[PDB]
Amino acid sequence: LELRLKSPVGAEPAVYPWPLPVYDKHHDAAHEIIETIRWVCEEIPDLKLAMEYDTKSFESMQRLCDKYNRAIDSIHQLWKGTTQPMKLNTRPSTGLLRHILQQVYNHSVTDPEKLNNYEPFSPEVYGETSFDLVAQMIDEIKMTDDDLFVDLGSGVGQVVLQVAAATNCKHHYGVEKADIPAKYAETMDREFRKWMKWYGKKHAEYTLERGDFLSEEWRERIANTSVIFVNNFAFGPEVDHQLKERFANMKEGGRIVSSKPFAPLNFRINSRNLSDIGTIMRVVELSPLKGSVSWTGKPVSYYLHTIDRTILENYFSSLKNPKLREEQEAAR
Ligand SMILES: Cc1ccc(NC(=O)NCCCN(C[C@H]2O[C@@H](n3cnc4c(N)ncnc43)[C@H](O)[C@@H]2O)C(C)C)cc1
Known part of the structure; x- marks a missing residue:
C-alpha cells in the first residue's frame, strides 16, 4: 500500500509507503503530503480552483491524493492547449521555501538525536529556527x-x-x-x-x-x-x-x-x-x-x-x- 503525488512539472512522483512514517514529535509524512498539496496549489492558481481529512485512514488519504493527481493531469492537459505553462525559471516564495526546507530536512536528517551534541544551531531565538x-x-x-x-x-x-x-x-x-x-x-x-x-x-x-x-x-x-x-x-x-x-x-x-x-x-x-x-x-x-x-x-x-x-x-x-x-x- 502506498500514496503518490505527481510533480507539477513532470518530475518523478513523490511516493510514500502506507502506513505513513513519522519523523519526530511535530512532523510526519501525512502532513508533509497535505502541505505539499497546499503549496502546489499556491504555485498554480488553476489547481487551487479545482481543489476543495482523516490522516490515519488510508481511504481518506488516497482520496485526497487521487483528487490532487487528477487535477494535476487536467492542468497538464490545459498547458498543452493555449494556456501558458507555469514559468520554470522562478525562485520559490518564502512560504513554499519554508515547506521545501522542512521536507528536505525530514528526508535527510534520519536521526535528530545525533545532532543534539552540536547544538545550538539557532541559539539566538527561543523555540524556533533562524x-x-x-x-x-x-x-x-x-x-x-x-x-x-x-x-x-x-x-x-x-x-x-x-x-x-x-x-x-x-x-x-x-x-x-x-x-x-x-x-x-x-x-x-x-x-x-x-x-x-x-x-x-x-x-x-x-x-x-x-x-x-x-x-x-x-x-x-x-x-x-x-x-x-x-x-x-x-x-x-x-x-x-x-x-x-x-x-x-x-x-x-x-x-x-x-x-x-x-x-x-x-x-x-x-x-x-x-x-x-x-x-x-x-x-x-x-x-x-x-x-x-x-x-x-x-x-x-x-x-x-x-x-x-x-x-x-x-x-x-x-x-x-x-x-x-x-x-x-x-x-x-
Ligand atoms: C544572523 C545569522 C543567523 C543564522 C546564521 N546561520 C546559521 O544559523 N546556520 C546554521 C548553523 C549555525 N552554526 C552552528 C554550526 O557551526 C559549527 N561550527 C562552530 N565552529 C565552527 C568552526 N570553527 N568551523 C566550522 N564550523 C563551526 C558547529 O559545528 C555547528 O554545526 C552557528 C551557531 C555557529 C548566520 C547568521
Missing part, C-alpha cells in the same frame, strides 16, 4: 550577482540553502567542521536539488563544505567574501576575537550579519582604540521581526556590519588639523 529571521535578513540586505556569500559554521546547511534559493549571489558557501552535521549536509544538498526540481523552482549556485573557518585557507576566503553570515551569539571571546582579525582583511563595502555585534553600536575612535575593528565598520542593529522571541522575551534583532574605512580616514584627517586635533584631545 528561518523566519533569515527571511527578513534577506529582504533587508540587497545582494546581487557581484556578491559571494558564506555561512560560517553552516550546520546541515539550512541557511545556505535558504539564501541560495532566494538571492542572485554568484556563489553561496557553507563551512562546517563537525563530522555528523557535515555528512547530513551532503544528503541535504542532494535532497534539496531533487525537491526544487520537483516543484519546478530555481536556486543560485551553492557548495556545502567540510572545514574549520578559523583555518589558514579560510583566512583568504573570508577576505574575498562580500557577505558573511555568522551566528555568533554563543561564541566565546577567543573565537569572536579570531573572527575580528579575519574580517579586518575584507574589502570596502563587505558585509557581516551576525546575532551578536562584533563592535559597539556607537564606537568613538580615539588614540587608545585605533586598532579595534570598530575603526573600520559601521554597525547597526537591524529591525527585529515582530512575533520572534529572544532570550529577553522581546523580538530578536540581528546586527549588520559594513566595512567602511572612511571612519579611520576622517580620524587621521582630524589629527592633521590643529583645531580638530585640539577638540579630539579635549574630550579624551
